[model samples]
Target: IQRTPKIQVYSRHPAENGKSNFLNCYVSGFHPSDIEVDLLKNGERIEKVEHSDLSFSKDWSFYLLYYTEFTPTEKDEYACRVNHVTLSQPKIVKWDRDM
Candidate 1:
């Protein structure tokens, strides 16, 4: 069993509002069956997208695609965690006025 890495997204400017934002999470040293990727908001699980094989080197890599719509006065949290027998703790990523 291999340990998975956490990936997060944050915006530099939160004052600028938009209907949706796009994020891409890429991880290296991951086998297809070795890791699972997820997206979360406010501690709730969001939809998962299809996994893709990403090769940055000789190692196997994986990626997650996320598109989130922003709501007024709402703070969004996005995280990617490794789910295995011993799951990795949720790595929180926030997109807000503070980025």
Candidate 2:
């Protein structure tokens, strides 16, 4: 059987307060790369992001690197939602904020 996809959600602090953008998230390796990834605030969804095209890794694994920048308007929970067949459930990984 093929391996499941992996995801990590995290943020940078020294990056900024109300000036620079800081939210980040990355999705890793899967076959048939037919999937969906999104950034969500608390429970709400969609905004914008700076990301990359799908690429294979050193081990021939396929993945997507996604990230977004913002000062934020509302303070709420943040997470990444990924939908894929390999996932038994919606893969939700929370993003951390140290502000």
Candidate 3:
């Protein structure tokens, strides 16, 4: 099946500048079992990331979770980048401040 992955970017807690937190990316509902999920900072790949084993639901769609330790800063951007066979271009999701 040709399906696009749903993407979400978030922090472990309410965003606060200079405080340590976790930046996360959740991707799901993709098909063909081939995908790339990257945690990004300011449009660059984050070096230190923890990724969960690929998973799927009964429908056979796949899901992936990736996270990294970060210090929230107002000047920087956090995002998730996804690449899949179903996408003509990479999909990116930006993190929003909880406050």
Candidate 4:
């Protein structure tokens, strides 16, 4: 059994139109066999724009980059889940309009 990895998701351009917004997925304590990423948007699956098998200098940190167009909407939710491993659960990151 592998250790539970830590995952992080961030949007580069939170609010921008016509530009590409980068969604970065980072996982710590990743193994070689555990190298699959799934991206979801609004509960729907999204295609991976960019992905890489990277590792940190000291820690076993892995990173995956997913990008999409920046279309501001109140119904946007993004999440990344790993395949074949249940370490880090699926995280939901959403964008809401200012009221």
In terms of lDDT, the best-performing candidate is 3
Query: Which lDDT tens digits does candidate 4 get at residues 1-99?
Result: 665555556565465444446666654555553456556676667774466544355553544444454444444566666553654455444433232
Candidate numbers, best lDDT first, in rank order? 3, 2, 4, 1
- TM-score leaderboard ranking: 3, 2, 4, 1
Put down candidate 1 lDDT per residue, 11-97, tens digits, no spaces. 423434434544444433444534555556666666643445533444445444343443324444554444544435644454344
lDDT of 1: 0.47
TM-score of each: 0.50, 0.73, 0.84, 0.60
lDDT score at residue 61, model 2, on the 0-100 scale = 60
Worst 10 residues of 2 by lDDT: 12-21
Lowest lDDT 10-residue stretch of candidate 1: 64-73
Residue 76, candidate 3: alpha-carbon lDDT:
85
Best-matching candidate per TM-score:
3
Residue 56 displacement (Å), model 1: 6.9
List model 3 lDDT by residue over 44-96, tens digit each: 88878888677766665666778888887878878889988777888888887
Clashes of each: 0, 1, 0, 0
* TM-score of structure candidate 3: 0.84
Better of 3 and 4 by lDDT: 3
Pairs with steric clashes in candidate 1: none
Which residue runs does candidate 4 get wrong by more than 4 Å? 17-20, 53-59, 62-70, 88-99
Q: Judge candidate 2 against the unseen true structure and give its global Cα lDDT, from 0 to 1.
A: 0.70
